[PDB]
Every structure is written in structure tokens, then in C-alpha cells.
Amino acid sequence: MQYKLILNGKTLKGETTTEAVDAATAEKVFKQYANDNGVXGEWTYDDATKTFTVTE
């Protein structure tokens, strides 16, 4: 349910979570969140904790 997002950008470092039932939907939500935050870059995620990491 709770998917995690670690934003490790150049001017934005932090983490947020969302209630998603589908990992692809979660990824889309997080990418929308990231783009809306004005960031983007390399995506590395671990399903072990369901943590999506945005690295610049």
C-alpha cells in the first residue's frame, strides 16, 4: 500500500509516501510529484521496502 519516494536531487533531498495499490501507478504518481517539484533524473527503486529513489 504505502510506497516510498526518496528524492535525491541537486537542490531537493527528502522523502514522501503515497497510498497506491499498483506499483506502476505509484511510480507514475511519484514521477508526477517529481516533475511537479521541478526535478527528474535517474530512477532506482528497491521492492524490498518499495522505495523509489530519484537521483540527479
Side-chain angles (χ1 to χ4, degrees):
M1 276 298 299
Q2 300 313 92
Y3 289 85
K4 309 167 186 58
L5 174 70
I6 294 177
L7 298 165
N8 191 92
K10 302 182 183 302
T11 187
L12 178 63
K13 58 176 181 177
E15 67 293 294
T16 184
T17 53
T18 193
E19 300 73 66
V21 291
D22 170 69
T25 307
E27 179 186 86
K28 181 187 68 64
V29 175
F30 285 146
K31 203 179 191 307
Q32 178 61 212
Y33 192 90
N35 171 270
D36 179 90
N37 278 211
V39 303
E42 307 302 291
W43 288 71
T44 45
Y45 67 99
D46 298 277
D47 181 82
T49 50
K50 282 165 174 49
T51 301
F52 295 90
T53 310
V54 188
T55 46
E56 303 190 281

